[PDB]
Enzyme design. Sequence first.
Site, short mmCIF file in Angstrom:
data_model
loop_
_atom_site.label_atom_id
_atom_site.label_comp_id
_atom_site.label_asym_id
_atom_site.label_seq_id
_atom_site.Cartn_x
_atom_site.Cartn_y
_atom_site.Cartn_z
N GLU A 1 0.87 -1.34 -0.52
CA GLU A 1 -0.06 -0.39 -0.04
C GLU A 1 0.71 1.41 0.27
OE1 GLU A 1 -2.12 -2.48 3.31
OE2 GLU A 1 0.34 -2.89 1.81
N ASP B 1 -1.59 -5.05 4.03
CA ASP B 1 -1.43 -5.30 6.21
C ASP B 1 -2.07 -6.14 5.55
OD1 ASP B 1 0.48 -3.37 6.64
OD2 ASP B 1 -0.73 -1.93 6.44
N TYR C 1 3.08 -5.31 13.71
CA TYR C 1 1.65 -5.01 13.12
C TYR C 1 0.84 -3.92 14.52
CZ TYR C 1 -2.42 -3.96 10.31
OH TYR C 1 -3.86 -3.34 10.04
#
Length: 556
Positions: free
Chosen positions: A8, A87, A295
């Site tokens: 992204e 993600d 994350y």
Amino acid sequence: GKALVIVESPAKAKTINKYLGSDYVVKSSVGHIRDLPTERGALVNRMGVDPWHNWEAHYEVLPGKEKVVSELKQLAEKADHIYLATDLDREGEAIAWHLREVIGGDDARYSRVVFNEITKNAIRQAFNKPGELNIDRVNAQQARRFMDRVVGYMVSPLLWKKIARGLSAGRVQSVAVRLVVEREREIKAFVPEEFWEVDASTTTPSGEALALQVTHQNDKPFRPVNKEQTQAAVSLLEKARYSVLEREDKPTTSKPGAPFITSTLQQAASTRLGFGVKKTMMMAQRLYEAGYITYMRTDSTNLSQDAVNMVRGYISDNFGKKYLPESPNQYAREAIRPSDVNVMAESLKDMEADAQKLYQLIWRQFVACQMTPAKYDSTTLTVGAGDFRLKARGRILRFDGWTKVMPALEDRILPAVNKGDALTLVELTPAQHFTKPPARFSEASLVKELEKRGIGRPSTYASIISTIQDRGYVRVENRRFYAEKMGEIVTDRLEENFRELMNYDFTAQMENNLDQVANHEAEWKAVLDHFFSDFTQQLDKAEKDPEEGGMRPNQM
């Protein structure tokens, strides 16, 4: 015939490229490539979703991204396989889906890779065992998107007509505002009550000072409500003979907290560093995309075997065996932690001071969670003085344990006394107190409340707290939330005409419904149908005149 890997952002692309060979071509999509647009027919055109035609959607390539689509399509034509490396959350799954849909080709051409951090090992493993796009997760994400769209685009216009132009309604946002409004009203209606405390300063047989608090009188809790009662007690206490009724010495311990999850990181960063939830999440994302932490959207306190081995080695080498538990502490897809325990906050590249501070907070929490408990020798003294009972509590640190990794230091140290010892009264100090109303929400306690009620999710905690402020329903001043008049006005109207939508349990249940879709336990369009059925039932009635049970106008 290389492989195409899509991420992204350029930051992610740069980091992941360090761990992918020449057979891989990494390219950023420069954000979301396609999404919903930013009478009934016009309504549907604006929303980009059709509740009346089985949720048919009209997605559009985002402004300026047609060029990105063209660039990806050409790269795809030269690739033998395409790896969607977005993600790991549902939003990420949906972004991957949009990418596949716009690029095209057979589905067998695509793989969806998942990783909790961008490191040589994590990436190697993610691309060794590549997965497939999970449509159930995509559907869960879109169901959420569509519900949110419906509430925002269909409730807001009602608010413009009934209350004021420009107002914005949100499915979860309105419920979060309700929390703050209720707290505001609890505080406004609170009637404080007066009560007093009496402390005694005494000396032990050795002459050492010993401070005591009066706890009981005639075997009942001591709590005078006015000056008269307090002075009467003080008169008796002045004349009493003091002696130690009991001395209890027992070892106590303090355990380190679990490694951070999204909610707790937000709370700790706010309380300990003074960072707002938005700032925390923005910096956390930068740390994650740079490959420094795992994350940042998670509700799992799990730690991988390798991560635990890594940190235990660090503790053993840098603190010693007394700081290392026999076996790893298990708190539980992974908690928020450093990707490499050997990387210090001071060594981070291209990270602002406050981002280094956040990393340090995460690092210390992670190291501490695998260290041994701190040990204290606690003492409680119970003293008798006529019909009164008094107490004193203190403790001595015997072993710092996990606190060693935290900044250097305060606990009270009581003098040595034996049961039966007489004490000499030196002074008595009465103190007037007042009961207090419920504490105001802070950014930390609001996040905690959202989590507690099952309304917030890792991907929405920050967005919720931010939106309710920008929309003018609540405001933060002196680090505490205050409900705005408009917040109360809208909340009252919504509670009256959209009871189900505003109900805490129903809102938590909706989050559960979405999880059900993600796990193939419910079907997304059916979930949306049920939501819309109940929603339109509330909306239709709300649009009517107040005389018929419709929403009350904002007047008089």
